[PDB]
Symmetry: C3
Subunit: 145 residues, 3 copies
Amino acid sequence: PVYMVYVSQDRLTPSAKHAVAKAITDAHRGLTGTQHFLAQVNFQEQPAGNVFLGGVQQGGDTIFVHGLHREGRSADLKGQLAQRIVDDVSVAAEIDRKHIWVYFGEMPAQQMVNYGRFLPQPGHEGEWFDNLSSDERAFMETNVD
Amino acid sequence: PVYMVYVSQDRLTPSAKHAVAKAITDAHRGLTGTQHFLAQVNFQEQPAGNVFLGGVQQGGDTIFVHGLHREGRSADLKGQLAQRIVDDVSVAAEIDRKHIWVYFGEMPAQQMVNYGRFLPQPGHEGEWFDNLSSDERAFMETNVD
Amino acid sequence: PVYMVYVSQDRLTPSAKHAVAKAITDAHRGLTGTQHFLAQVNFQEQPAGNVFLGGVQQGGDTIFVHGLHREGRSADLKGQLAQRIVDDVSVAAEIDRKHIWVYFGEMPAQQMVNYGRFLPQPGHEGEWFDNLSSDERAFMETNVD
């Protein structure tokens, strides 16, 4: 799945980026079964003050998580996953929840490419892991915590 | 709402960013009834030349707005909201309509959180506010202008 | 369409940006019939290290393409389009296919604006064009390469 994380520049240090990305990947794989390496966490940093809420300019603390998922998961499980991301980014980034916004958008996997391959749907992903395999299977194996 | 606003770097001065964030905030609350403080504006600045149209590179004038809503509103009203955003950002930012792109994507409210809480349905944002935590109500009340 | 392209900073030379944008514009125009100038390519550069896969930080090579489309096109056509984008970007940008992710999201044409004007349905693009103002038509005609 793709996790766009919008943050102000220099609110997350390198270690805190590694921590938040770990937490998000851990939550996603824990709740969906997705293989670790399929989770992109992609940090979009902008200068603090680029964020407005109700027209009031903000400091550097607001974190917005735009998660792009395959269609096919239950509303209950998406609710759990988003809450757990709220909690776990609170902890990893060591920031209060009030600054955490979380949105999941869903597409058909048939229009979703990861690592250059069309995603299967959660009716697969164990079987899916065949692929352009070898160079591909092994390129994925490394991008795992 | 979360409004992603993609613009070329330092094309809007901070004061102009404030003006565009108030155009958008005012538009969403006027047509939807939502609070003021629920409107996030997140400016993504990239250097000029990053926007290509028909393969032709651009200067710093393109504004692209990706507004993320929860589902439940009519097409008629969404068109009115997008049109008003086109016009009022044109004035606040001092840019022509021909440079303005606006896209609304919709999600179920149950898979969208912010200020650390799951959104309600568009029918009734008063309930949700009065039922939130007191510390959270007060933090949201600070982001209103 | 708007094609959000997430890239590592200063990994694409200006000419490589022109090549990637042209590759995506030509793919969309060729496979769908839309006019050249309707293809927006928006490059979002972040410093290498902002991208995590399975919790592992990457060098400056991961590319993610988030395409924003109107509704109405078939899964077959979207699949070919995503595949063509993967291949044509792999060559234009000189990147391996395993570094390429592509996601298409779709909205109703009535909640979508380009050049300050409401998009039509995909069965409409030519009839749609001629009735735009003569200045809006001509600003569009220059955005063709």
